[model samples]
Target: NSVSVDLPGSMKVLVSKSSNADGKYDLIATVDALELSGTSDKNNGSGVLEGVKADASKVKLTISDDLGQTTLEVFKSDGSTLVSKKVTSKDKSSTEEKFNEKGEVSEKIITRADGTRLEYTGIKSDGSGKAKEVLKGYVLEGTLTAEKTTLVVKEGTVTLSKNISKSGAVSVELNDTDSSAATKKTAAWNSGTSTLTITVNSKKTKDLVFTSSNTITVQQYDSNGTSLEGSAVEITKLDEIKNALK
Candidate 1:
């Protein structure tokens, strides 16, 4: 449960729900994916998140605020699985996902910036998925075992900013992770040292924040330094992280 109020520029502005500019919409949502119906609230309009399945697929969400509105969708295909979220806020971030059909997530690509840009991709079944931060020249490989899954930068320097960089592996639990479901998440890994950790949320959930993507805790450590020693724990409340950063 969370709330956001419109910033009143002035007394006239605050009292003005002119309708010319749709009054900023407020969103309220509650979810229980393991088993339960997803819910939402409406302000200028209505909103909701659907298909609260454990696997986290076939889910949909709709909502609107002062800045804009958002829609999220997930579905499956013969050789692929896809999840997408489109948002209208700030620079406006959107998400697109692709899954390589498998008992485990074989190959998956989640994108940002509309369904047009590719954000991340995994190509290995059991954790053998490969993801390369194209903008950063970092190569990541996904590997999953009976117990868990991991994405490691087996080779190449992980480019953080254009000028700064580090390398490490990010691992997430898969004991029973069907999808991003209500799990753990991540935060930008910028301590005082060398390691680049970005949110490993199935989707950043940025604009969608708490209502859309399933999040988990991506616990990181600079202990191993440029190695596959970093860990991602499947915790909860990723909504908090999203709100804090994006």
Candidate 2:
């Protein structure tokens, strides 16, 4: 044919692109093609990419050149939120999310930003995405690593399993942002069966007890080393206060 028009999903429309939606675009404008040619040259008004040539390497994405520029968004668009991300580098230089109305961050990944990215999606729904949105809400019943420091929280209890002296004090800061009369919890690993001793710095005498599992194990001992102190308890979430100290 002297005249023929190639379609989307790829120029070769003879082999139609998959579209169960009657008519939906799925063709990928791969970086190879874009790089040799054009890019987000057509900014949708946001001059951020009016004519900015995206880094070929960075321009590369998981899926087709679809939804992956590492957004810098709000915590919430309709109301108030605490999630935002800045894909400044090859990774999340700074991204955080705090949905569920809880200060706790999840899927925050190297960081987690509130579903502020939700704004980009569409209208926000009632916070029904708890157990749902909980995708990011991590209940760290295990280890949280920051370089070498480890923060372990079993149920309502928290312990900083580390070693060595803290500045000058023999006490390891379990993690405390504003250190005052705030008695913190910390730990040290002789390496193996690390024994975790639990304590409480609460008001009521019995309040100073973690109601989760066993009693305070031992100083410099592996947790499993002592099954049941026969007397263990639950501890309140000193999470935020704990993280801040780091």
Candidate 3:
């Protein structure tokens, strides 16, 4: 017979000894429920992880994604920042003109890769309130008939000798103050084709005098054989008139 006992008021444990001599036994226990607590320096707000402000002369900004775009802006000391701008490539060749104190434009040239030198000239106002077009893309070849005019007898004829060169066709016009008539003629270079004959009406002889009232318009042409219009020639033969009267 063996004695046995059980206890349960608060907590109880039981152990058995040697059911048979020299027997061995083993016991194991495991923890099921536990509580843990932790802390980091980030709570104190005084570590390198905290945010701060700094000043620098320059800064480089970077983006993480390749799809991001970038732009540069300039600023003036007056607190105005320049707007974003687009970039342009430089031209292979270009020219510019500079001016002097006298308002005269200085010429400049630029050569391109194609071996063509781009030439430019500046036309300064001559202070006469008119702009002069500097000659370009054209050459001066020859002069037409030298500008000439004459005063013939009231019933006499006026002839014009035409000169031709590289300049275009030359022409002449007669304006009579007494009759207020304008007659134009195209001068022929050779073969005497360019001639003007004027016959004053008998009733207008007294009024046909060239006393600043009448004029003959003679026009010259350029090398290209184009008549240079708007130019005038004076044909006051006052000396001939005096000689004829004597």
Over 105-220, each residue of candidate 2 has an lDDT whose tens digit, in order, gives 44343222322121111112322211111112233222222222222433223434332121311122243333444554343322233333333243211112211121122222
- Superposed by TM-score, candidate 1 places the C-alpha of residue 59 at a distance from the truth, in angstroms, of 9.1
**Tens digit per residue, CA lDDT, model 3, 41-128:** 2211111111111321111111112212211112222323321211111333333333444325444333333323323344335311
Clashes of each: 20, 30, 7
The all-Cα superposition gives candidate 1 an RMSD in Å to the true structure of 18.6
Compare candidates 1 and 2 on TM-score and give the better one.
Answer: 1
State which candidate has the highest TM-score.
1
The lDDT of each candidate is 0.34, 0.27, 0.25
Distance (Å) between predicted and true CA of 173, model 1? 24
What lDDT is obtained when candidate 1 is compared to the true structure?
0.34
lDDT of 2 at 228: 38
What's the ranking of the predictions by TM-score, best on top? 1, 2, 3
Predicted structure 1, TM vs. truth:
0.28
Question: Which portions of model 3 miss their true places by more than 4 Å?
Answer: 1-166, 180-192, 202-238, 241-246
Displacement of the residue 163 alpha carbon in candidate 3, Å: 10
